[PDB]
Design a binder for this molecule. Structure first.
Ligand SMILES: [Ca+2]
Ligand SMILES: [Ca+2]
Ligand SMILES: [Ca+2]
Ligand SMILES: [Ca+2]
Ligand SMILES: [Ca+2]
Ligand SMILES: [Ca+2]
Ligand SMILES: [Ca+2]
Ligand SMILES: [Ca+2]
Ligand SMILES: [Ca+2]
Ligand SMILES: [Ca+2]
Ligand SMILES: [Ca+2]
Ligand SMILES: [Ca+2]
Ligand SMILES: [Ca+2]
Ligand SMILES: [Cl-]
Ligand SMILES: [Zn+2]
Lengths: 397, 397, 397
């Protein structure tokens, strides 16, 4: 991985710095590194591809070194350098794709393609150079058994889940009480409804609760918490739990009462916020618990009184809700988020080359399936595959 | 462009590295580059501005070289260096603004200001240095006729469009069937409504479809697809198609049935997803097609039955919807997105200096107008102008 | 600050570049810088911690220099280098945390911990090196009394505010007119309602207005403006202004008429947009003013006519709204946003070590409280603290 990264890094720097007119002193060290790369590769043969429709490609290295005697580089110097650069870029791109389309239940963190396995040999170690990207830094820190951390914008931590739970129901579904929600990506919306508006409830208050267990701990999370669940604030016709019929939801929204959000880690409360809407920080957690209540308004104007009778039929359904969004966070495991193209790169290369479903990843690299059962093997393979996607993106986008 | 970029890059590195106390070995190469820049500029005169209220400014270069003999830089060394740096920064900033406020139907990708045209001369090529930003890398790759790729967070690909299409309507607008939507930025929300709840429809199912044609292909897109269109889930009074009257929309939402999203490229299905909500990958597409149905519930509790009579008046309007958001994607053409300040920089400089409307860009650099008719000339000019904005932002924010 | 940053930068580069196999020429300059750091620190003793539960830690420097004679670095070279690196990383991390948990009403921009105060001494200035991060660049520019600019994605500029204003009301709350809104983070949603649907209003039009005053000027803002306020498009039971009772809101949405958004700076209109939805640029402003109207539909189909009678009771409440979101912007003052982890880092370190509430920051570093009363002292302390968090994140995430 580090050598593959170094190949890419060497090529990116070469492409960027070996430009017409530049002082040789601006590239002297890079030329040394570039030539070290040529010397190390020269004489070797590699073959990539062959899985799915990823073409079999042969690579042969017999390049001359780059000159070291111009004061300022001229166009001919730059152009001959690019001939070599373009070939190596094509090679790196193919090694990356070959590596990205493979997986292993047994040793997922290890190189899977022939070329990466070959590049992991001790004779290729002299190419190693400036491992500075966040992904390679993390790869290296992991390897030395140290603490790794990936920063995400809208971390895709919640597998898609949209459902409800009726805590009080009856065949006619005319006097229900329960919750409905949508957990997806970095967002949670949950509504608690009570068709009776807590008419016979103790203290005329109905308690609700929504618990979400993350598959990985998130640290240093910046979160937006807002009252109301807009998604569950409109009239709906929903399928019954058994799928046998449909019920009617006609919500009228009240402010959630006694809101308490707890960010827990291994059952322990790490952060707790009582009725605080806006931006809050959750520093270390693997579980979110949202508790909120519907309290029947003790004083009601006529228009309100008319919505909540003492007896059925209950035609306006009292609803309270919350919306929680994780804007950014750090995770020790790789994850998909709203900004990085890694998942999309890996998924795209596999799709383009008709790569057959393997033993590790769910069909289509489906994110929900992946995060729902995020096993150690899937994570090691995902990290390997995400790191390669990031090496490839330094040169090919 | 590359020389202008190099000027900015040289100045940014100088400002960052030529700091008090630093080992001379930390800046030796930079000093060489800095001095190459001074030597190349010395003796030249440039003039910027004069368009709109952008002031006419004269620049004269007659600077001494930076010394090369301190072991660790002292405060006096740093301060005399900054006198030169600040002047060059002011110059670069003015060249950038002068370039950003100009456009050309004929040769939009080429330098438009006198200073950039002057800097494109062969005598200024020795300043060229470390072209490493994503924008200049792309500029250079484009120039060598190679594949460029810009990565965006929430790519602003959809011109604002908010409308409806009544597939079945009548003067009273009491039994409509059709769709309404909002395409804007990176998001699409579309709802299909049938006032009759498919009472007389074959298989009691009404089919809907929404097609969106992108003005540019997006690759490696990470997308969130969710059922329901919250934006079209509430009661509305809308203007009729002919503007002569207003109709009433009183939606009740049902789950979209047989959801199928197709990401097509030149008429070919590249990706297709059947009822998959959550995160999905669209690898290469220029068109999105959302197909969904409203199926009359075969089994209805009384409360539901009451909403859907066998005869008019139809007072509750059955509605199904979808929401699609492009979180990130790569595009071969520059675009505005939710994170980059390029469009805002260009638009801001033009607005501040009262730059008159030109022959290429729509008044006010209006994004919707621009993307709606994204001609080759507008793109070449936009890219030139975005690349300059990015050169300027290395020094002036 | 600059020396602390330089320590971190030196360590990050060392960790990244001093890798097995690398050409010595790839690290020669860094080794010089690394050794300059060792020489400068050697002989010194520092102590960190002791506030709250941040442990008291002692640091002693007596390290040998790194060798300068290998052609390509070997594993033993890399491993002995890491022993020194890991210790310095641990030291930098502790200095950062000690600094991040402190504050001062008097001189908030100045170092507060013993270690940072010690590192600000002239004898430690030789460590200074390549101050290139956006935060340190800004710190340095501020210091030279120059223009600083931080770029944010979804700048968290609006303190949480969710409320309403009844311009016409009566005890029964059966014929209200006013506005309700939610200002939070980078978003504003505001709705204007008129239970009478402007039946007795001049020109059958009711005017609305929403003004939001930013605590800091935002420049180069890319904004999404859309008609309708989904958050206020559903039925609600709300508490009365005096808290004595509850009123009923049963909205029916109409298109906002004569929409005018003004971005003002010190009372002056800098940007104005008339009914333009989609993406707009606001280049320099400290205030946003949204003006919109509800115009009674001059022509109504029966279904619409039935919602708006000539006399009470008014059962369907005409509502018009707007949604405005600041996607990105530049601010001269540090702020929390949807991507940076600074606020979360500072807040997290203080929470983890049970740091007592101080004299500057609100309890829990509460963002709303902070931005609501963003005094000069809070900003100077926030900037110091955010810059340290950013120095720490180069090594520890
Ligand atoms: Ca062969
Ligand atoms: Ca990231
Ligand atoms: Ca309703
Ligand atoms: Ca756990
Ligand atoms: Ca792991
Ligand atoms: Ca002149
Ligand atoms: Ca971007
Ligand atoms: Ca096409
Ligand atoms: Ca193009
Ligand atoms: Ca002591
Ligand atoms: Ca930022
Ligand atoms: Ca002001
Ligand atoms: Ca300030
Ligand atoms: Cl976002
Ligand atoms: Zn975002």
């Amino acid at each position: 991985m580090d050598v593959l990264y170094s190949l890419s890094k060497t090529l990116k720097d070469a492409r960027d710095k070996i430009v017409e007119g530049t002082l040789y002193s601006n590239v002297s060290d890079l030329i040394q590194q570039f030539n070290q790369m040529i010397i190390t590769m020269n004489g070797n043969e590699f073959q990539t591809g062959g899985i799915g429709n990823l073409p079999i490609r042969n690579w042969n290295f017999d390049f001359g070194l780059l000159g070291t005697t111009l004061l300022n580089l001229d166009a001919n110097y730059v152009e001959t350098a690019r001939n070599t650069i373009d070939y190596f870029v094509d090679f790196v791109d193919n090694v990356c794709m070959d590596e990205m389309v493979r997986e292993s239940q047994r040793n997922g963190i290890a190189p899977q393609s022939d070329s990466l396995i070959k590049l992991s040999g001790i004779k290729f170690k002299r190419i190693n150079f400036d491992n500075s990207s966040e992904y390679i830094e993390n790869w290296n820190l992991q390897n030395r058994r140290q603490r790794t951390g990936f920063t995400f914008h809208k971390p895709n931590i919640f597998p898609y889940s949209a459902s409800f739970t009726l805590n009080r129901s009856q065949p006619a579904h005319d006097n229900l009480m329960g919750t409905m929600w949508l957990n997806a990506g970095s967002e949670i919306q949950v509504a608690g409804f009570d068709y009776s508006c807590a008419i016979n409830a103790p203290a005329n208050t109905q308690q609700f609760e929504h618990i979400v267990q993350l598959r990985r701990v998130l640290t240093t999370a910046t979160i937006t918490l807002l009252p109301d669940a807009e998604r569950f604030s409109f009239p709906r016709v929903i399928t019954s739990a058994d799928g046998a019929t449909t019920w009617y939801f006609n919500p009228v929204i009240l402010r959630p009462n006694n809101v308490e959000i707890e960010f827990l880690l291994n059952g322990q409360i790490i952060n707790t916020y009582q009725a605080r809407f806006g931006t809050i920080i959750a520093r270390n957690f693997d579980t979110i618990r949202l508790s909120f209540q519907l309290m029947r308004p003790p004083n009601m104007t006529p228009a309100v009184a008319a919505l909540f009778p003492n007896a059925q039929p209950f035609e306006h359904h009292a609803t309270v809700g919350l919306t929680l969004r994780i804007e950014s966070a750090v995770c020790e495991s790789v994850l998909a988020d709203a900004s990085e193209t890694m998942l999309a790169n890996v998924t795209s290369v596999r799709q383009e080359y008709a790569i057959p479903v393997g033993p590790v990843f769910p069909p289509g690299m489906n994110w929900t399936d992946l995060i729902t059962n995020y096993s150690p093997s899937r994570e090691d393979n995902l990290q390997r595959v995400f790191t390669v996607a990031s090496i490839r993106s330094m040169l090919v986008k």
